């Protein structure tokens, strides 16, 4: 049990996801980020 | 949060 802040998704990836307002675009961005 | 909120501000002022 440890602090899981900015562990897998940093703030840049989070901002990229926020810029993706549509469901399809955010799915594409998540697929790009999660490898 | 007294270390990683306000001392962050002081650390930035200096850094």
């Amino acid at each position: 049990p440890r602090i899981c802040m900015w562990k897998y998704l940093d703030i840049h990836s989070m901002h990229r996801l926020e810029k993706a307002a549509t469901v399809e675009k955010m799915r594409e961005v998540l697929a790009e980020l999660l490898e | 949060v007294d270390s990683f909120r306000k001392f962050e501000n002081d650390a930035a002022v200096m850094i």
Binding site: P1, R2, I3, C4, M5 | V1, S3, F4
Partner: protein, 55 residues
């Protein structure tokens, strides 16, 4: 139950203010809502991901 208790211990690492082992990021209502949703959904569908992701 093992992962249940593991994530329960992880929850107090984020719901209570006690550095460096925890931090007050959330609110009590958010804790309760997340616990409600996860206990409702994922562990009911535990066998789903068990059949897929486990050899």
């Amino acid at each position: 139950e093992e992962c249940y208790r593991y994530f329960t211990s992880v929850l107090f690492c984020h719901g209570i203010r006690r550095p460096p082992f925890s931090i007050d990021l959330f609110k009590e209502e958010q804790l309760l809502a997340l616990a409600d949703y996860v206990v409702n959904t994922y562990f009911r569908h535990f066998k789903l991901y068990k059949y897929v992701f486990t050899p």
